[PDB]
Design a protein around this nucleic acid. Structure first.
Lengths: 55, 48, 99, 150, 117, 109, 142, 35
RNA sequence: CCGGCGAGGGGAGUGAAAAAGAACCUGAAACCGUGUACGUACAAGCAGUGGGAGCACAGUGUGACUGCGUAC
RNA sequence: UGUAACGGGGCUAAACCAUGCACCGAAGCUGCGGCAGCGACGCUUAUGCGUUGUUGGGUAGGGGAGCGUUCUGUAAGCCUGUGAAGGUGUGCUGUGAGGCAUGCUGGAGGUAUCAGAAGUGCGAAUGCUGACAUAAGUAACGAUAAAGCGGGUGAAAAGCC
């Protein structure tokens, strides 16, 4: 329930081989306002798929 | 015959045992006292 | 054209114009030195006890000390430790003759 | 050390090393182990060892020509300027003057000069006869110093 | 005369961490681990100055044995045949010949095969 | 010309900030900006402030020309920890480390 | 003057082919391990793969003396608690007769990354024909 | 702006050294049977 | 100037010096990063040591493979 | 627990017995170079140094030599703003503790020598103090009475109004 030996710099970074965040690299431009947005999300100004939805 | 030229006679000054100061001195880790008994304690040693 | 001679308790195989490092010979720097005891001269044709008249003649280059070795003696749990350094004297000779 | 004799924690039970005083010398801010006391660093010198030394220093000062005997060394005014001249003609810079009389005119005139010391032939010592480049003695003073060293 | 010991304990520690370059992990950084890394590394260095002279004699003997057997004799009969012929070349040079001048080794084997039998 | 902007004593832990820093290491500074905009971390809001400041530190002082900037160096150091106390069960107390960090963005044409 | 060491680029391993019909197994298998390792060469150096590529042919016709055909058992364990499976020599000749030469040679090669690479140069075939005509293997007569 | 506050420890342990170490009252480990 | 009329930072300036900027002389070590060279994804164990390629630099660095080797 | 009673592979000799020869094999011996202790040497003419003999595994322990640190004298001396101590590298050389030179930081003090005095050398004492790791970005976020929306403000609102 507790370690017998302090793990190393090696094993601490080996565990964080999968802690690395994944960037999006998939921003989508809107066809009526040219805003980049998340795919299938509305824009910051409230356009979505060419239509003004939220305003 | 200046103050930085005067020496003692040879052998007039022996150094003095410094105990418990490492392996090379031959007096480390017990202080010349051996292992655990009455005589190796601080103040130990029987009377005359 | 190489030959085998034997100088500092060890045997060396040298060619012409080669420096070989030997044990510390006590001959001054710049003096020609003969090694009359040549074990085996070889070429396209080879000559092997000792040879009869082949002499390696060299020329003394330098008298240095070697890279320092650390001698560490250790006895675990027994309160014993001993360091010592060592630089070994050598003699470099450039080989100026294979007979 | 200012502190209480309270044992800091209990002897058993807590997993900390056993302690019994906050003023133990292993601890920070408590206790020098073999702490100093004011002591006397004087040594005994035998009189025949003290006199044998001074007879052996004065014998060596005439060997390395650092004893110069004068017959009078006195200066008229109690002025450091005159004595500063006193040894230029004498060709002295680091000197110890040893006189037999109680000359207070000469005594003040070397009180500011660092390398010049005036004595009274009875307080000359080991380290003063060595740490000066020339020792200059008046002839009345070398009569007394010859006497006390027999 | 109080003596602070930060300057010469730093230097004594720094001297040992400098001998521990290239060691893994805390054996290069931590003094307690790096001290007994360096003391063990000097212990091995003493021992393998003995083992170096054995490991190379092992390596020469294995190469003379191979190069004798290409010339049709074993190492034992080649070394016995050289001693009966009073040839005094050591095994360092006998192995040096065996890779660099093979025709100077087939002559040595012949001078051993002759004076043996 | 390398242009530095720093954010010292950033109140997020350095391991949390270093996750977001590896997203924008070497990227072009326009692409680095909207990686940090659609990253759902608190460190993403912190690092984007330094990058947007290094963008203005370049074009106000050293020169101009936003569009050829790149996030050349990006590295997170550990600032001084603020030490706090969480009380635990049975009288016990623990030390909480409010771990600060030092975000440094070096932008460069 | 340092002793020569062979290099793992300038070494040139030659291809040999061996007909293992009627040969005593570990008398065969120890000359294979000698030449897989490279101890028959004056250029031998114990940290470099200096050996040869040996093609063993007719592995199923390898011979053992005595009663070893029915009494030499091959023990392997599968990692599970039952585990200890075993096959005699004649069962091993029926199932995978290539394995008999390969097991015997593998115990005679050194243990480690290098001896595992010396095992890669032992091409063992149960039949009489290999595929390595392009490497032009010389006949190595045992 | 009045910053760089300290790490005010608990007012229980007067040796801040062990303040975050052990509670120093009772050590209950109860399963010991040696005979 | 960027920022939230922030915090922090980048300039400009002072000064011999701001890597003396107040969390301020010097600033070690543990510990934590970034950049670069080399090694590393079929290889078993006190992590070194002896041998040793290859590579990268201008001797240094790394260290495949390998012998011996169970800390204090 | 798994072959598990050649170390293994394997061996019908690679096993036993007898004989013989060769070889391998240690830090033993020899060679080569170095160093030290002890003697015998009058070898020298304080006697160093030489010549020969032989010895140098070591715990407890005894004996003999040193190294370095701080402080006093030598020191109103020498070094030092044309860069001290310290820190950090590198190189050189001592049998060792170590020593020296120097590139960069540092920005004002340091001390040949020979003596003198010791708070004189740390890896350990479940040592003491500070700092920082580790587990681990894990457990948890303290009553399972419960929240959802729309406005507002704001740099930002699940929590504020």
């Amino acid at each position: 329930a507790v370690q017998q030996n302090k793990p190393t710099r090696s094993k601490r970074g080996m565990r964080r081989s999968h802690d690395a965040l994944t960037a999006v690299t998939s921003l989508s431009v809107d066809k009526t306002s040219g805003e980049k947005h998340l795919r299938h999300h509305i824009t910051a100004d409230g356009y979505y798929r060419g239509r003004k939805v939220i305003a | 015959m200046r103050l930085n030229t005067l020496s003692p006679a040879e052998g007039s000054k022996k150094a003095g045992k410094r105990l418990g100061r490492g392996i090379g001195s031959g007096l480390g880790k017990t202080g010349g006292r051996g292992h655990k008994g009455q005589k190796s304690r601080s103040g130990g040693g029987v009377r005359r | 054209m190489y030959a085998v001679f034997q100088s500092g308790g060890k045997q060396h195989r040298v060619s012409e114009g080669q420096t070989v490092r030997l044990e510390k010979l006590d001959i001054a720097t710049g003096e020609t030195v003969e090694f009359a005891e040549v074990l085996m001269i070889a070429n396209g044709e080879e000559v092997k006890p000792f040879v009869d008249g082949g002499v390696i003649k060299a020329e003394v280059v330098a008298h240095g000390r070697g890279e320092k070795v650390k001698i560490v003696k250790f006895r675990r749990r027994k309160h014993y430790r001993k360091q010592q350094g060592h630089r070994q004297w050598f003699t470099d000779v450039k080989i100026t003759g294979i007979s | 050390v200012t502190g209480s004799g309270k044992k800091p924690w209990r002897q058993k039970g807590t997993g900390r090393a056993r302690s019994g005083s906050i003023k133990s010398p292993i601890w920070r801010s408590g206790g020098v182990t073999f702490a100093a006391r004011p002591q006397d660093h004087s040594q005994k010198v035998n009189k025949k060892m003290y006199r044998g030394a001074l007879k052996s220093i004065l014998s060596e000062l005439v060997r390395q020509d650092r004893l110069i005997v004068v017959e009078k060394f006195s200066v008229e005014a109690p002025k450091t300027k005159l004595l500063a001249q006193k040894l230029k003609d004498m060709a002295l810079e680091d000197v110890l003057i040893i006189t037999g009389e109680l000359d207070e005119n000469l005594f003040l005139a070397a009180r500011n000069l660092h390398k010049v010391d005036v004595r009274d032939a009875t307080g000359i010592d080991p380290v003063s006869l060595i740490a000066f480049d020339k020792v200059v003695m008046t002839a009345d003073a070398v009569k007394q110093v010859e006497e006390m060293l027999a | 005369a109080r003596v602070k010991r930060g300057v010469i304990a730093r230097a004594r520690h720094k001297k040992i961490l400098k001998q521990a370059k290239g060691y893994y992990g805390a054996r290069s950084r931590v003094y307690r681990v790096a001290f007994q890394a360096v003391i063990k590394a000097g212990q091995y260095a003493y021992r393998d100055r003995r083992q170096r002279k054995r490991q190379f004699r092992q390596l020469w003997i294995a190469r003379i044995n191979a190069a004798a057997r290409q010339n049709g004799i074993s190492y034992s009969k080649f070394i016995n045949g050289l001693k009966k012929a009073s040839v005094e070349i050591d095994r360092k040079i006998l192995a040096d010949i065996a890779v660099f001048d093979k025709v100077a080794f087939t002559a040595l084997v012949e001078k051993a095969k002759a004076a043996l039998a | 010309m390398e242009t530095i902007a720093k954010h010292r004593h950033a109140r997020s832990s350095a391991q949390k900030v270093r996750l977001v820093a590896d997203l924008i290491r070497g990227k072009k500074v326009s692409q680095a900006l909207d990686i940090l905009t659609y990253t759902n971390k608190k460190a993403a809001v912190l690092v984007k402030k330094v990058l947007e400041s290094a963008i203005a530190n370049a074009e106000h002082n050293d020169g101009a020309d936003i569009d050829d900037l790149k996030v050349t160096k990006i590295f997170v150091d550990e600032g001084p920890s603020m030490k706090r106390i969480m009380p635990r069960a049975k009288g016990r107390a623990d030390r909480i480390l409010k771990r600060t960090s030092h975000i440094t963005v070096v932008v460069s044409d | 003057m340092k002793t020569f060491t062979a290099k793992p680029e300038t070494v040139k391993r030659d291809w040999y082919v061996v007909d293992a019909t009627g040969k005593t197994l570990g008398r065969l298998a120890t000359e294979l391990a000698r030449r897989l390792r490279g101890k028959h060469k004056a250029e031998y150096t114990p940290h470099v793969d200096t050996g040869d590529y040996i093609i063993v042919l007719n592995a199923d016709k390898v011979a053992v003396t005595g009663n070893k055909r029915t009494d030499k058992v091959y023990y392997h364990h599968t990692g599970h608690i039952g585990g200890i499976k075993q096959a005699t020599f004649e069962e091993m000749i029926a199932r995978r007769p290539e394995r008999v030469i390969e097991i015997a040679v593998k115990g005679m090669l050194p243990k480690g990354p290098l001896g595992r690479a010396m095992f890669r140069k032992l091409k063992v075939y149960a039949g009489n024909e290999h595929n390595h005509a392009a490497q032009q293997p010389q006949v190595l007569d045992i | 702006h009045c910053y760089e506050c300290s790490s005010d420890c608990p007012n229980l342990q007067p040796y801040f050294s062990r303040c975050f170490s052990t509670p120093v009252w009772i050590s209950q480990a109860q399963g010991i049977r040696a005979g």
